[PDB]
């Protein structure tokens, strides 16, 4: 899997839009581990368990972990916005609702390989985008 | 006589590294076929491992494999080693611990390879495999399928809730094909097998480096699951008969175990090489 | 009975070295065509490989290929060999294991070459290929395209060039064109095929030399994907008809496998030569 | 019945050997003009190739080309062959596989040669080529230029010399000029053409001599790229009208291919001689 | 290809300027592996992910890996300085700002075929120029 530069652009705007990256191009140092752990959880336990774990808002974590799931949703929406007409016949090009829970969206849409592939690519893009900035 | 098909049965989790950089979860990926994107062994790696096994017999290695690197006399090797392609992969289930999974495209590729290379005992295998593939295509009628040939494995979950096994009573499985492909065989569609063999579904092993009991490094390694079957073609390039006989005898001896791939010291790539049994 | 066209179907990865010193990552680069930059085989290597296959029949080699390099008397070769230009390449796909990739410029070059050389069965193939190319250009309307002709292959993604194929229903692909260009054929724009066949997207393999377990050397090799299709033209001069018939029968026999290029001992460059079938 | 212009239009790689003492890596270099260093063919080679093609027609060879070297009596040939200068060469492009590269200096040299030789259809070609050259100079205004005439070819990239193709819409390329200079024509400065046609940019091929798998010799070869166009002048003196007409008709026949160059058996230097069509 | 002497000179000057080679003609050993791995990473992954990985500061590495990205930027700047400014040419001669990370420049300056070619040539020049010096 090769990460495109447009995916990294989407990741940068999504990390700024949620609030991972501050106005001085800095981020809390724990989001690096958050994204790495999300990738590991997706590869090991599965898409749904990892999404449920990192989507939870009533955490004991130092920072807001659910913002990485928000960044995921924004990156996936940006990726789907550029889907071609012939892609929309095979792939689902509908936009994920902003207030919708990502885990329940995945569950209602099944467990299709499209969603898992998009999540993995977006997680790698998030990791690469964080690698471009300073850890506080 | 010239061309023989050998089956590789792995006894541990095998890793033949592709050596490429992956910036995702898995730092070390395995070799994949350039065309079919299925796990494979490069013929160079196979030849190197087998040459390492036979290194003691200097005359046999010199005649069969060729001259050692940077020897004064560079003589070519006579036996030609072809790359090993994935035949069967174990898949986790709920009715049995694991099942032998092969796709229709893998079967078609095997049939085409036997047709092109003209293996020793290829005629009966091609006939029966073509009959099985035709029956499978007739039963499937263009849809996704997961066909088991044991009635007790009906409704088994093949590693994914979507993939469920159905037993077509009409399609027979010959005992020699069962021996070649493996017990508890399931025939999967290309989509199902590709999903079950992609980078998000292949087994990964987590490793860390400890300094005074404290973790320094951490990475994930992709592995080919234990008891996986791969087939490769051996061509007898006018090599001497007695050395060839010794080579095939040692290679096919049940006591012989060969290490292929990386992480030899931690017991990764240990395999058994079998010849294509007559039908 | 002159200047007929032969098609090369590779049974494994092919490496025909260019012999140019590349100081980048890929030290061993494959041979590429002078004008179109597509992978190719020089007629020198083709003649060498075919002579090596036929070297047992001394009289046939002497009549058709010429004389040995250290023979006291010299004899010119009577058969004219031509460079093998790439026709179809396998590309990864999601609905099928791979697709057969050809470009509109490749088709134009093939039509022009057949017109100039007037192959044995050239007329019908030229007419039908011109019709197919005209239909493709009519449907494309100057835009980038990826056209498949089996209705089941609609929406198949080329993995390297992340473009999904469309099915133009009104463009017919004849069975003889299927036999020539290959099954599961996708016709792309020139840019898509150039990106697919460039050095960055051709299969590159990592190799090393081990001395008692530790790596002594390391280099990167690029190869032509297995099942790649290449075509060359063969002109017979004042050659005897009996030797020519023997040569054509042996060369086009389904049991005949020719090794072209490097790395013969690790199963590289094994192919089958087929003649242009009558339309 | 006078001086006539002929175009060569090589259909393959061409290597006409100089026999010069090489100072670099390329052992076999191609013939180049002494003054302009452009690739050329000596008139002796042209006469030899054309006589080889017509050798079966004994009367035509005796009348036009003269007596055989062993002939007991010597007859001077009535036809005078001149040098074959490079007209156009294919250069690597991005929007298209290649473009036919011509320079202003070679166009001016061609105009001077037609004026000096007084070819059959010289006048109209001289007038139209002079108008085209004057328009090119008016548009360039002392700057380095690269002009395409197909509107689709605007923005094309010549790979070796990183320059971009511009489209002057007020410079019409007449159809006869296209037939003479080639399709997808690029007119650029002679510095770019000299760089493209120099020793470092002409295709260089590595060649081998293998004895029982051992390399005996190694050398590198220089070739003229396929689809390159060369022009020469043929002076008939005053030959028999029947033999001259037979010669012209056989030369202009689309099915007639002439071998000019060294490596005949591996298909080097097969061309299609054309005549200067009326404008 | 063939070795470009001017690019080797640029590589020497950039290696000296980016504090790779000490006052004595000596460099830390791991930089050889860094330079060698950069090209393989560029080919196997994308150019953007490789530049992100090597440009990443605050990493866990035996030395300053971002220095090779600095050297690459200096070499590319020298090449663009030497570029001939003529019409109908493809190359853009504008220098890469010293306040710009290479990743950001490649991100907002796409159609990066010229940038890819320059980066590969600069990597080859760096690899060949590093052999004039000794590893500690």
Short mmCIF file of N, CA, C and O in Angstrom, two decimals, chain C residues 17-21 31-37 42-44 47 52 55 65 69-70 77-83 85 105 109 112-113 115-118 190-191 194 235 238, chain D residues 9 11-13 56 90-98 184 203-207 209-213 216 220 223 225-227 254-255 257 259 264-268 270 272:
data_model
loop_
_atom_site.label_atom_id
_atom_site.label_comp_id
_atom_site.label_asym_id
_atom_site.label_seq_id
_atom_site.Cartn_x
_atom_site.Cartn_y
_atom_site.Cartn_z
N UNK C 17 19.62 -8.51 -19.14
CA UNK C 17 20.36 -7.37 -18.64
C UNK C 17 20.75 -6.40 -19.74
O UNK C 17 21.10 -6.79 -20.85
N UNK C 18 20.68 -5.11 -19.41
CA UNK C 18 21.08 -4.06 -20.34
C UNK C 18 22.58 -3.79 -20.31
O UNK C 18 23.10 -3.19 -21.26
N UNK C 19 23.27 -4.20 -19.26
CA UNK C 19 24.71 -4.01 -19.19
C UNK C 19 25.15 -2.58 -18.99
O UNK C 19 26.31 -2.26 -19.28
N UNK C 20 24.27 -1.71 -18.51
CA UNK C 20 24.62 -0.32 -18.23
C UNK C 20 24.81 -0.13 -16.74
O UNK C 20 24.06 -0.69 -15.93
N UNK C 21 25.81 0.66 -16.37
CA UNK C 21 26.18 0.85 -14.97
C UNK C 21 25.22 1.88 -14.38
O UNK C 21 25.33 3.07 -14.65
N UNK C 31 16.45 -4.90 -20.07
CA UNK C 31 16.68 -4.35 -21.39
C UNK C 31 15.42 -3.66 -21.90
O UNK C 31 14.32 -4.23 -21.85
N UNK C 32 15.57 -2.44 -22.40
CA UNK C 32 14.44 -1.63 -22.84
C UNK C 32 14.65 -1.17 -24.28
O UNK C 32 15.78 -0.98 -24.73
N UNK C 33 13.54 -0.99 -24.98
CA UNK C 33 13.57 -0.63 -26.39
C UNK C 33 14.12 0.78 -26.59
O UNK C 33 13.90 1.67 -25.76
N UNK C 34 14.84 0.97 -27.69
CA UNK C 34 15.54 2.22 -27.93
C UNK C 34 14.58 3.39 -28.11
O UNK C 34 14.82 4.48 -27.57
N UNK C 35 13.50 3.20 -28.86
CA UNK C 35 12.62 4.30 -29.25
C UNK C 35 11.43 4.43 -28.30
O UNK C 35 11.10 5.54 -27.87
N UNK C 36 10.78 3.32 -27.97
CA UNK C 36 9.57 3.37 -27.15
C UNK C 36 9.84 3.18 -25.66
O UNK C 36 8.90 3.29 -24.86
N UNK C 37 11.08 2.90 -25.27
CA UNK C 37 11.48 2.69 -23.88
C UNK C 37 10.73 1.54 -23.22
O UNK C 37 10.76 1.41 -21.99
N UNK C 42 16.79 -8.03 -27.25
CA UNK C 42 17.53 -7.85 -28.48
C UNK C 42 17.58 -9.15 -29.27
O UNK C 42 17.51 -10.25 -28.71
N UNK C 43 17.67 -9.02 -30.59
CA UNK C 43 17.71 -10.19 -31.45
C UNK C 43 18.97 -11.01 -31.22
O UNK C 43 19.00 -12.21 -31.52
N UNK C 44 20.02 -10.39 -30.68
CA UNK C 44 21.23 -11.13 -30.33
C UNK C 44 20.95 -12.15 -29.24
O UNK C 44 21.31 -13.33 -29.36
N UNK C 47 18.60 -14.91 -30.60
CA UNK C 47 19.33 -15.87 -31.41
C UNK C 47 20.21 -16.77 -30.55
O UNK C 47 20.29 -17.97 -30.80
N UNK C 52 21.09 -22.05 -28.40
CA UNK C 52 21.41 -22.91 -27.27
C UNK C 52 20.40 -24.05 -27.14
O UNK C 52 20.77 -25.17 -26.79
N UNK C 55 21.29 -26.53 -30.07
CA UNK C 55 22.70 -26.86 -30.25
C UNK C 55 22.95 -28.35 -30.41
O UNK C 55 24.01 -28.74 -30.91
N UNK C 65 21.51 -21.00 -38.29
CA UNK C 65 22.07 -19.97 -37.42
C UNK C 65 23.44 -19.48 -37.88
O UNK C 65 23.79 -18.32 -37.60
N UNK C 69 31.56 -19.75 -33.23
CA UNK C 69 32.50 -18.62 -33.18
C UNK C 69 33.95 -19.01 -33.38
O UNK C 69 34.73 -18.19 -33.88
N UNK C 70 34.34 -20.23 -33.01
CA UNK C 70 35.71 -20.69 -33.19
C UNK C 70 35.84 -21.75 -34.27
O UNK C 70 36.82 -22.50 -34.29
N UNK C 77 24.60 -16.63 -41.18
CA UNK C 77 23.30 -17.15 -40.81
C UNK C 77 22.27 -16.86 -41.89
O UNK C 77 22.24 -15.78 -42.48
N UNK C 78 21.40 -17.84 -42.14
CA UNK C 78 20.40 -17.71 -43.18
C UNK C 78 19.07 -17.17 -42.66
O UNK C 78 18.33 -16.55 -43.42
N UNK C 79 18.77 -17.39 -41.39
CA UNK C 79 17.53 -16.92 -40.79
C UNK C 79 17.79 -15.56 -40.14
O UNK C 79 18.80 -15.37 -39.46
N UNK C 80 16.87 -14.63 -40.35
CA UNK C 80 16.97 -13.29 -39.79
C UNK C 80 16.07 -13.18 -38.57
O UNK C 80 14.85 -13.32 -38.68
N UNK C 81 16.67 -12.91 -37.42
CA UNK C 81 15.95 -12.73 -36.17
C UNK C 81 15.73 -11.24 -35.93
O UNK C 81 16.53 -10.41 -36.36
N UNK C 82 14.64 -10.91 -35.25
CA UNK C 82 14.33 -9.52 -34.93
C UNK C 82 14.05 -9.38 -33.44
O UNK C 82 13.70 -10.34 -32.76
N UNK C 83 14.24 -8.16 -32.95
CA UNK C 83 14.09 -7.90 -31.53
C UNK C 83 12.65 -8.15 -31.09
O UNK C 83 11.70 -7.93 -31.84
N UNK C 85 9.61 -7.18 -29.03
CA UNK C 85 9.00 -6.02 -28.40
C UNK C 85 7.83 -6.45 -27.53
O UNK C 85 7.10 -7.40 -27.85
N UNK C 105 -0.92 2.93 -28.10
CA UNK C 105 0.32 3.13 -28.85
C UNK C 105 1.01 1.81 -29.15
O UNK C 105 1.61 1.64 -30.21
N UNK C 109 1.84 0.59 -32.87
CA UNK C 109 3.16 0.11 -33.25
C UNK C 109 3.10 -1.29 -33.84
O UNK C 109 3.78 -1.58 -34.82
N UNK C 112 1.62 -1.03 -37.37
CA UNK C 112 2.60 -0.48 -38.29
C UNK C 112 3.70 -1.48 -38.61
O UNK C 112 4.12 -1.61 -39.77
N UNK C 113 4.18 -2.21 -37.60
CA UNK C 113 5.22 -3.21 -37.82
C UNK C 113 4.72 -4.34 -38.71
O UNK C 113 5.45 -4.81 -39.59
N UNK C 115 2.31 -4.08 -40.94
CA UNK C 115 2.16 -3.52 -42.29
C UNK C 115 3.51 -3.44 -43.00
O UNK C 115 3.61 -3.78 -44.18
N UNK C 116 4.54 -2.99 -42.29
CA UNK C 116 5.86 -2.86 -42.91
C UNK C 116 6.44 -4.23 -43.27
O UNK C 116 7.04 -4.39 -44.33
N UNK C 117 6.28 -5.21 -42.38
CA UNK C 117 6.92 -6.51 -42.57
C UNK C 117 6.04 -7.51 -43.30
O UNK C 117 6.57 -8.49 -43.84
N UNK C 118 4.73 -7.29 -43.34
CA UNK C 118 3.78 -8.15 -44.05
C UNK C 118 3.91 -9.60 -43.59
O UNK C 118 4.35 -10.49 -44.33
N UNK C 190 -1.72 5.76 -23.24
CA UNK C 190 -0.27 5.64 -23.30
C UNK C 190 0.37 6.00 -21.97
O UNK C 190 1.35 5.38 -21.55
N UNK C 191 -0.16 7.02 -21.29
CA UNK C 191 0.42 7.44 -20.01
C UNK C 191 0.26 6.36 -18.95
O UNK C 191 1.19 6.11 -18.18
N UNK C 194 2.76 3.64 -19.73
CA UNK C 194 4.11 4.12 -19.46
C UNK C 194 4.39 4.13 -17.97
O UNK C 194 5.50 3.76 -17.54
N UNK C 235 12.49 -13.85 -40.22
CA UNK C 235 12.60 -13.91 -41.68
C UNK C 235 13.58 -15.01 -42.05
O UNK C 235 14.71 -15.04 -41.55
N UNK C 238 17.58 -17.67 -47.83
CA UNK C 238 17.74 -18.83 -48.71
C UNK C 238 18.03 -20.08 -47.89
O UNK C 238 19.01 -20.80 -48.10
N UNK D 9 14.39 5.45 -44.22
CA UNK D 9 13.32 5.06 -43.30
C UNK D 9 13.57 3.64 -42.75
O UNK D 9 12.87 2.68 -43.07
N UNK D 11 13.53 0.46 -40.63
CA UNK D 11 12.48 -0.18 -39.85
C UNK D 11 13.02 -0.91 -38.62
O UNK D 11 12.23 -1.52 -37.89
N UNK D 12 14.33 -0.87 -38.39
CA UNK D 12 14.92 -1.53 -37.24
C UNK D 12 16.18 -0.76 -36.84
O UNK D 12 16.49 0.29 -37.40
N UNK D 13 16.90 -1.29 -35.86
CA UNK D 13 18.19 -0.71 -35.48
C UNK D 13 19.17 -0.87 -36.63
O UNK D 13 19.16 -1.88 -37.34
N UNK D 56 20.02 -11.12 -57.71
CA UNK D 56 19.39 -12.16 -58.51
C UNK D 56 19.15 -11.68 -59.94
O UNK D 56 19.32 -12.45 -60.89
N UNK D 90 14.24 9.53 -34.18
CA UNK D 90 13.22 9.46 -33.11
C UNK D 90 13.83 9.77 -31.75
O UNK D 90 14.87 9.23 -31.38
N UNK D 91 13.17 10.66 -31.01
CA UNK D 91 13.61 11.03 -29.68
C UNK D 91 12.51 10.67 -28.69
O UNK D 91 11.32 10.67 -29.02
N UNK D 92 12.92 10.36 -27.46
CA UNK D 92 11.97 9.94 -26.44
C UNK D 92 11.07 11.10 -26.03
O UNK D 92 11.53 12.23 -25.84
N UNK D 93 9.78 10.82 -25.88
CA UNK D 93 8.79 11.81 -25.49
C UNK D 93 7.92 11.24 -24.37
O UNK D 93 8.04 10.08 -23.99
N UNK D 94 7.04 12.09 -23.84
CA UNK D 94 6.17 11.72 -22.74
C UNK D 94 4.71 11.55 -23.15
O UNK D 94 4.07 10.58 -22.74
N UNK D 95 4.16 12.48 -23.94
CA UNK D 95 2.79 12.32 -24.41
C UNK D 95 2.69 11.23 -25.46
O UNK D 95 1.64 10.58 -25.59
N UNK D 96 3.76 11.01 -26.22
CA UNK D 96 3.81 9.98 -27.25
C UNK D 96 5.06 9.14 -27.01
O UNK D 96 6.00 9.59 -26.33
N UNK D 97 5.10 7.91 -27.53
CA UNK D 97 6.31 7.10 -27.35
C UNK D 97 7.57 7.76 -27.89
O UNK D 97 8.63 7.65 -27.27
N UNK D 98 7.47 8.46 -29.01
CA UNK D 98 8.62 9.13 -29.60
C UNK D 98 8.15 10.22 -30.54
O UNK D 98 6.98 10.25 -30.95
N UNK D 184 4.43 13.21 -36.37
CA UNK D 184 4.81 13.74 -35.06
C UNK D 184 6.19 14.39 -35.12
O UNK D 184 7.10 14.07 -34.37
N UNK D 203 21.79 4.79 -28.86
CA UNK D 203 21.64 3.54 -28.10
C UNK D 203 22.91 2.71 -28.13
O UNK D 203 23.52 2.49 -29.18
N UNK D 204 23.31 2.24 -26.95
CA UNK D 204 24.48 1.39 -26.78
C UNK D 204 24.02 0.08 -26.16
O UNK D 204 23.32 0.08 -25.14
N UNK D 205 24.40 -1.03 -26.79
CA UNK D 205 23.95 -2.35 -26.37
C UNK D 205 25.15 -3.20 -25.97
O UNK D 205 26.18 -3.21 -26.65
N UNK D 206 25.00 -3.92 -24.86
CA UNK D 206 26.02 -4.85 -24.40
C UNK D 206 25.79 -6.21 -25.04
O UNK D 206 24.65 -6.66 -25.18
N UNK D 207 26.88 -6.86 -25.44
CA UNK D 207 26.81 -8.13 -26.13
C UNK D 207 27.79 -9.12 -25.51
O UNK D 207 28.80 -8.72 -24.92
N UNK D 209 29.56 -13.37 -25.50
CA UNK D 209 29.94 -14.61 -26.18
C UNK D 209 30.10 -15.68 -25.10
O UNK D 209 31.00 -15.59 -24.27
N UNK D 210 29.22 -16.68 -25.12
CA UNK D 210 29.15 -17.68 -24.07
C UNK D 210 29.63 -19.03 -24.59
O UNK D 210 29.16 -19.50 -25.64
N UNK D 211 30.56 -19.65 -23.87
CA UNK D 211 31.06 -20.98 -24.17
C UNK D 211 30.75 -21.89 -22.99
O UNK D 211 31.40 -21.78 -21.94
N UNK D 212 29.78 -22.78 -23.16
CA UNK D 212 29.37 -23.72 -22.11
C UNK D 212 29.01 -22.98 -20.82
O UNK D 212 29.32 -23.42 -19.72
N UNK D 213 28.34 -21.84 -20.97
CA UNK D 213 27.97 -21.02 -19.84
C UNK D 213 29.04 -20.08 -19.34
O UNK D 213 28.79 -19.31 -18.40
N UNK D 216 33.10 -15.72 -22.94
CA UNK D 216 34.37 -15.65 -23.64
C UNK D 216 34.80 -14.21 -23.92
O UNK D 216 35.93 -13.83 -23.62
N UNK D 220 30.62 -3.69 -26.56
CA UNK D 220 29.45 -2.83 -26.64
C UNK D 220 29.30 -2.31 -28.06
O UNK D 220 30.29 -2.08 -28.76
N UNK D 223 24.22 1.71 -32.29
CA UNK D 223 23.25 1.52 -33.36
C UNK D 223 22.48 2.82 -33.58
O UNK D 223 22.35 3.65 -32.68
N UNK D 225 18.87 4.49 -34.10
CA UNK D 225 17.55 4.06 -33.63
C UNK D 225 16.60 3.74 -34.78
O UNK D 225 16.69 4.30 -35.88
N UNK D 226 15.69 2.82 -34.51
CA UNK D 226 14.68 2.43 -35.49
C UNK D 226 13.74 3.60 -35.79
O UNK D 226 13.47 4.43 -34.92
N UNK D 227 13.27 3.66 -37.03
CA UNK D 227 12.39 4.69 -37.60
C UNK D 227 13.16 5.96 -37.92
O UNK D 227 12.53 6.97 -38.28
N UNK D 254 6.06 -1.31 -51.73
CA UNK D 254 5.92 -1.36 -50.27
C UNK D 254 6.42 -2.65 -49.64
O UNK D 254 6.74 -2.66 -48.45
N UNK D 255 6.49 -3.74 -50.41
CA UNK D 255 6.91 -5.03 -49.88
C UNK D 255 8.42 -5.24 -49.97
O UNK D 255 8.89 -6.34 -49.66
N UNK D 257 12.19 -4.62 -48.78
CA UNK D 257 12.99 -4.25 -47.61
C UNK D 257 14.46 -4.46 -47.95
O UNK D 257 14.83 -5.52 -48.47
N UNK D 259 18.49 -4.40 -46.58
CA UNK D 259 19.34 -4.53 -45.40
C UNK D 259 20.61 -3.71 -45.60
O UNK D 259 21.45 -4.05 -46.43
N UNK D 264 23.08 -8.54 -40.07
CA UNK D 264 21.93 -8.95 -40.87
C UNK D 264 21.12 -10.05 -40.19
O UNK D 264 19.89 -10.03 -40.24
N UNK D 265 21.80 -11.01 -39.57
CA UNK D 265 21.10 -12.18 -39.04
C UNK D 265 20.25 -11.83 -37.82
O UNK D 265 19.27 -12.52 -37.54
N UNK D 266 20.61 -10.78 -37.09
CA UNK D 266 19.83 -10.37 -35.93
C UNK D 266 19.08 -9.09 -36.27
O UNK D 266 18.78 -8.27 -35.40
N UNK D 267 18.76 -8.93 -37.55
CA UNK D 267 17.83 -7.91 -37.99
C UNK D 267 18.26 -6.47 -37.77
O UNK D 267 17.46 -5.66 -37.28
N UNK D 268 19.49 -6.13 -38.11
CA UNK D 268 19.99 -4.77 -37.98
C UNK D 268 19.98 -4.09 -39.35
O UNK D 268 20.61 -4.59 -40.29
N UNK D 270 17.25 -2.93 -41.51
CA UNK D 270 16.27 -3.18 -42.56
C UNK D 270 15.47 -1.91 -42.81
O UNK D 270 14.91 -1.33 -41.87
N UNK D 272 13.25 0.81 -45.89
CA UNK D 272 12.30 0.90 -47.00
C UNK D 272 12.61 2.17 -47.78
O UNK D 272 12.27 3.27 -47.33
#
